[PDB]
Structure formats: C-alpha cells, structure tokens
C-alpha cells in the first residue's frame, strides 16, 4: 500500500533533485544536435509510438554495441533525457543505443521487459560486434532481465559481454508495499517472476552491480541482493546519489565507462 514509499523515494533525499530532469533534457538535446548525422534518432523496434530507440554512431567502425536503458520506475521519462550519457562509450568506439518503452500503468513491467528484448534485438541487427548493457534504476532491472535466455534470443545473448546495472531494482517484492504498485498492478508471483534475484539461468556475461554510496538504504540493499544471488562484481561509487551516479557515463575516462567497455 504505502509502508515503503519513503524508503523508495529518491528525490526527497537528493539536494537539487528538481533540477535534474530539466538539465538532463537540455544536455541530451545539445548532444544530439552536436552529433549531426551520427545520431540516428527514433529508429523503430516495434509498432507502438514508444517502440523507438536512438542510435549514436562513433566516428570509425564501431568496436561493438552498448545499450543504455533509462530509469524512472517504469512510469516516467523516455530516451530523450539521456543521450548525452553516450559520450564516454562513443569516444572508445562503441555505437550506443537507447530505447524508450511503454510505461506503467498502460503496460505491465513484464511487457516492458519484452519490449527491451525487442529493442536490444533490433539494435543488435544494426551494429555488429560484442554487446554491453547498462541501465539505471528500473533500467538496471531491465538490463538484468536481458540475461534470461527465455527473454532474449540466443543469437543476441551469446554476444553479451558485460552487464552493468546501475542502482538496479533486483527484487520487486518490496514494491508491492509501495503506492507505485497502483501503477505496476503486480501480485506476489508477478513480482517474483520479474525479479532478477530469481533468475537461475543466465547468459554468460560479466555482471557488475554499480550503486552510489550515498544512495537510499533500499537501493544499497537492492544492489547487494543482486550481487549475492548472481555472485556478481560490486562497486560502490564514492558519495554518489541516485541521480548523479550515472554522470560518469559522459566521461571517456571514468571507471564506470571502463567496466562497461572492459
């Protein structure tokens, strides 16, 4: 109902929280405009209005494909607020894909998972080479689900090299105790079915759970749960909160860019 609302609230505990959305949108727009025809915007992966992805190409032959899946608790944002985060990987020669997806309550989280699979699959036809995945928050959840062979085709999964869920939701059960479940509309079995900690079969890939040191206790817990279940690597980013933890993606030399492209 609402017992865990405060526990899962990020913005309320982040100084300047209100300023992130507008600045991301502005930063992303400027980046797209800067890239000219190396920005392939609004490529379709499906028929729906939000079944689109942006594909950012490096200057030379891409060394591979990096898919970034954005967050917003599966109920807000689209791909357009995050383009500028393609810079670090682009500088190392990776093509970078960013999908949008339909949002709850129009769809269920399980349907969103299926859409990300469709998106990764489409991007993987555009770019040859190894595939690396990163995703933030709900997006961290979504990239974690891509290692499920029942979700993503073998031909794509076989190519996944690294998966880096940044501040992921790994166990959806506690969300049943949040008002956001009025939108997700999950019962216990649905939360379990969509929880990465429950996945026993995974494509072979180096998984590194990346979480901010100054994040909500709930997010620190969600991270270590994933680390425990999968024996994944684990990085705690010094003094980072839920909104600036992703900032190093813009920096070619960041440790976050390094673990994603390793």
**In the complex with Cl ion, which residue's Cβ is closer, 114 or 244?**
114
Provide the minimum distance between the beta carbon of 126 and Cl ion in the complex, in angstroms, as a whole number: 29
Phi, psi of 237 (to 5 degrees): -75, 115
Token pair belonging to 216: 């909500």
Identify which of residues 91 and 110 has a Cβ nearer to Cl ion in the complex. Answer: 110
Task: Quote the least distance from Cβ 110 to Cl ion, whole Å.
Answer: 4
Q: Which residue number, 17 or 107, has a Cβ lying nearer to Cl ion?
A: 107
**Cβ proximity to Cl ion, 24 vs 184, nearer residue:** 184
Residue 235 forms beta bridges with which residues?
A: 210
End-to-end CA distance of the chain: 42
Number of neighbouring beta carbons within 10 Å of residue 227:
19
Nearest distance from residue 168's CB to Cl ion, in Å? 16
Compare residues 35 and 142 and give the one whose CB is closer to Cl ion. Answer: 142
Q: Is the CB of residue 76 less than 8 Å from the CB of residue 49?
A: no
Question: Which spans of this chain sit near Cl ion (rule: CB under 5 A)?
Answer: 108-110, 190
Tell me the sheet residues that pair with 82: none
Asked if the peptide bond before residue 89 counts as cis, ω within 30 degrees of 0, the response is: no
DSSP state of 106: T
Q: Are 134 and 65 in contact (CB under 8 A)?
A: no
CB nearest Cl ion: which residue? 110
Task: Give dist(CA 26, CA 19) in Å, integer.
Answer: 11
Could you tell me the smallest distance in angstroms from the CB atom of residue 118 to Cl ion? Answer: 16
Residues 6+ apart with CB under 8 A from 15: none
Q: Where are the alpha helices (DSSP H) in 40-105?
A: 87-91
Give whichever of 109 and 156 is closer to Cl ion, judged by the CB atom: 109
Smallest gap from residue 193 Cβ to Cl ion (A): 7
Q: What is the DSSP string of 87-101?
A: HHHHHTTEEEEEE--
Of the two residues 108 and 145, which places its CB atom closer to Cl ion in the complex? 108
CB of 109 to Cl ion, least distance (A): 4
Residues 185, 212: Cα–Cα separation, whole Å: 28
Q: How far is the CB of 173 from Cl ion (least distance, A)?
A: 12
């Amino acid at each position: 109902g609402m017992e865990l609302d405060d526990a899962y609230a990020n913005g309320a505990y982040i100084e300047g929280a209100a300023d992130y959305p507008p600045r991301w949108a502005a930063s992303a727009e400027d980046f797209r405009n800067s890239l000219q025809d190396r920005a392939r915007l609004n490529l379709s992966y499906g028929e729906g209005d939000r079944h689109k992805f942006d594909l950012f190409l490096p200057e030379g032959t891409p060394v591979g494909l990096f898919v970034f899946v954005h967050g917003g608790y599966w109920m807000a944002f689209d791909k357009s607020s995050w383009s500028h985060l393609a810079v670090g990987a682009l500088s190392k020669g990776w093509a970078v894909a960013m999908p949008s997806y339909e949002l709850c309550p129009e769809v269920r989280i399980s349907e969103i998972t299926q859409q990300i699979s469709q998106a990764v699959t489409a991007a993987a036809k555009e770019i040859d080479g190894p595939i690396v995945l990163a995703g933030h928050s709900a997006g961290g959840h979504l990239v974690a689900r891509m290692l499920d062979p029942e979700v993503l085709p073998e031909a794509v999964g076989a190519r996944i090299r690294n998966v880096v869920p940044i501040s992921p939701l790994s166990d959806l059960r506690p969300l049943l105790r949040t008002s956001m479940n009025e939108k997700f509309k999950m019962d216990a079995d649905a939360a379990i079915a969509e929880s990465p900690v429950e996945m026993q079969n995974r494509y072979d890939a180096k998984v590194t759970v990346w979480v901010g040191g100054a994040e909500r206790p709930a997010f620190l817990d969600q991270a270590i749960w994933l680390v425990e279940a999968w024996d994944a690597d684990h990085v705690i980013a010094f003094e980072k909160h839920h909104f600036n933890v992703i900032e190093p993606l813009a920096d070619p030399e960041s440790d976050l860019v390094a673990v994603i492209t390793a």
